[PDB]
Amino acid sequence: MSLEIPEDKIKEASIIDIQLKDLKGNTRSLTDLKGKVVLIDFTVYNNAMSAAHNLALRELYNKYASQGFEIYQISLDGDEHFWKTSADNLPWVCVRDANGAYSSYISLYNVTNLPSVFLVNRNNELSARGENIKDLDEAIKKLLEGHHHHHH
Known part of the structure; x- marks a missing residue:
């Protein structure tokens, strides 16, 4: 959405709104994915390590996505070939x-x-x-657990 510096408690500008576009060209921001709990992933769509890392993400998704969880995965590789496919x-x-x-x-x-x-x-x-x-x-x-009259 935009980079603004809010404050009140903890620390100011405690959240970075990451605006990068997705596979389809839709410019995603963390202010956009605010509908769920956002997993910020930084990996390379290229590397064998991403495969096993993606499985861990896949698990976590099958776990909590149904309750309002999303994975925002950012490709730092630079290769649209393996990324796009x-x-x-x-x-x-x-x-x-x-x-x-x-x-x-x-x-x-x-x-x-x-x-x-x-x-x-x-x-x-x-x-x-x-x-x-x-x-x-x-x-x-525990992020989701904020629902039971708390923040977890």
């Missing part, structure tokens, strides 16, 4: 970065390593980094 048959959101590994977003997070994952709950709140989340299963669960 693979993503065409993919369930969740598949978009591409402008520079991939040299992403401005990657620079903004100070993620550095890659590939990586990051968490976002329903309100498009940045939950935590993948390096911090050794429990994405429970993480996405």
Whole structure:
């Protein structure tokens, strides 16, 4: 949607609205996917490591997607060939970065390593980094658990 800096608690500008377009050309933003809890995936549609990583995502999807979960997957590879062919048959959101590994977003997070994952709950709140989340299963669960008069 747009990059604005909100504040009140915790930290200001705590959520990055990632605007990149998907396989069909639809420019996706995290403010768009706010209807669900957003899984921020940073990987390369190219690498064998993406295959096994995608399975972990596939699991998490079969788990919580039915309750309001979505995977926003960003391709940092730069190859529309493997991206387009693979993503065409993919369930969740598949978009591409402008520079991939040299992403401005990657620079903004100070993620550095890659590939990586990051968490976002329903309100498009940045939950935590993948390096911090050794429990994405429970993480996405507790994000959804805000429904029981709480934030989890």
